[PDB]
Design a protein around this ligand. Structure first.
Ligand SMILES: *[C@@H](CC(=O)OCC)[C@H](C[C@@H]1CCNC1=O)NC(=O)[C@H](Cc1ccccc1)NC(=O)[C@H](COC(C)(C)C)NC(=O)OCc1ccccc1
Ligand SMILES: *[C@@H](CC(=O)OCC)[C@H](C[C@@H]1CCNC1=O)NC(=O)[C@H](Cc1ccccc1)NC(=O)[C@H](COC(C)(C)C)NC(=O)OCc1ccccc1
Lengths: 188, 188
């Protein structure tokens, strides 16, 4: 079956409800005070985290070397709690997957799991007129209110939900190297 | 943890989407062509089952010996497929339970699981101004669109979702004896 136990361990220790000018989103915390949220959430200088106003210390809207949208924004937050480090659960590479679960943590749905079946490395996507790269796709009618939802298989956190058309859903991939302690150049 | 595998086996083989004048509802099929749906769905002479118009051969709105609403309606349907017999998964008696899952099968959510935690045998409920008896309660903000949702623990199907107030949800109980091959008197 689907790895429900695993999806639930991730939801329990590594998600929070985030609210921007654009609405609420499931937010996956990845390692220290660093989390992700779909770029189309429009993150500013402050963000509500479980209804608490929180300073956004850094926000990086990921684009690839063709300068195309990846629909991931990595945010660094001013909070007291660290997130459990889940970088080892992240895929090294692009892949296809079986039997994924999509999980949501919003005010409307504080704890909710949807098997979306099989996940295909889909690539290009015209996401609401923004060209976007590196999308995962599943044949499940995902809805508004699920963006930022965490897509897992057992032992792997593979993406966050960002789009759908009524019959498929789309997640932006997560890769391990998005989050590695690195080198120093001007990013804004 | 919660019995997700089990909730999913019930959703797979024993649920259908039912549409009445009142909207869509998760519908638990119990044994032959016999299913349940919340009384407030207002079942008539026909019902849509996975969008197919279906004759309702019999509908019993359960009330108890105080003549109070139980919010269960047992329906007998004109369909070709039998439902897998799940009467042995039904509780004999009123009880409290741990770590239940609420599952939903609608057009909006064809396959969806929510851990609602602990389930208490709650009793009386003023359900939208209808006095109702024999209600199960869980501390989880359930929403419209979840009515008829199936509440399980591992190995037991204990109720169907019927109400909530923004902080708790309420299910009407299912008991084994609701569904036993019986004696003959005029029920309408
Ligand atoms: C999550 C964000 C939200 O709830 O509202 C915006 C504040 C939401 C989830 C999807 C909506 C419907 N199904 C979903 O799973 N995502 C979006 O709305 C996308 C834009 C976005 C806004 C904010 C944050 C992140 C992303 N847009 C789409 O998903 C878009 C939906 O457009 C309509 C026309 C279907 C409503 N989908 C899309 O453009 O896919 C293109 C496509 C592909 C293949 C065939 C036909 C069309
Ligand atoms: C499912 C039916 C539906 O979606 O709409 C009607 C066609 C729905 C699910 C609940 C709605 C909000 N939360 C839920 O989990 N159930 C209902 O709407 C109930 C009536 C019903 C209609 C059709 C079929 C089955 C049942 N009504 C309620 O749940 C009611 C909600 O009323 C408001 C005022 C909160 C909107 N709840 C209620 O009356 O509880 C009383 C209470 C108890 C303790 C403290 C305060 C109030």
């Amino acid at each position: 079956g689907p790895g429900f136990d695993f999806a639930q361990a991730i939801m329990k220790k590594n998600t929070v409800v985030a609210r921007t000018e654009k609405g609420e989103f499931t937010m996956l915390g990845v390692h220290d005070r660093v989390a992700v949220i779909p770029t189309h959430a429009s993150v500013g200088e402050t963000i509500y985290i479980n209804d608490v106003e929180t300073k956004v210390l850094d926000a990086c809207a990921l684009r690839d070397l063709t300068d195309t949208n990846l629909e991931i924004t990595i945010v660094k937050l001013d909070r007291n709690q660290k997130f459990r480090d889940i970088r080892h659960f992240l895929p090294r590479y692009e892949d296809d997957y079986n039997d994924a679960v999509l999980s949501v943590h919003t005010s409307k749905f504080p704890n909710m799991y949807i098997p979306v079946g099989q996940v295909t490395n889909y690539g290009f996507l015209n996401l609401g007129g923004t060209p976007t790269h590196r999308i995962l796709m599943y044949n499940f009618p995902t809805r508004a209110g699920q963006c930022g939802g965490v897509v897992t298989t057992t032992g792997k956190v593979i993406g966050i939900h960002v789009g759908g058309n009524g019959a498929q859903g789309f997640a932006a991939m997560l890769l391990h190297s998005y989050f590695t302690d690195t080198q120093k150049h001007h990013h804004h």
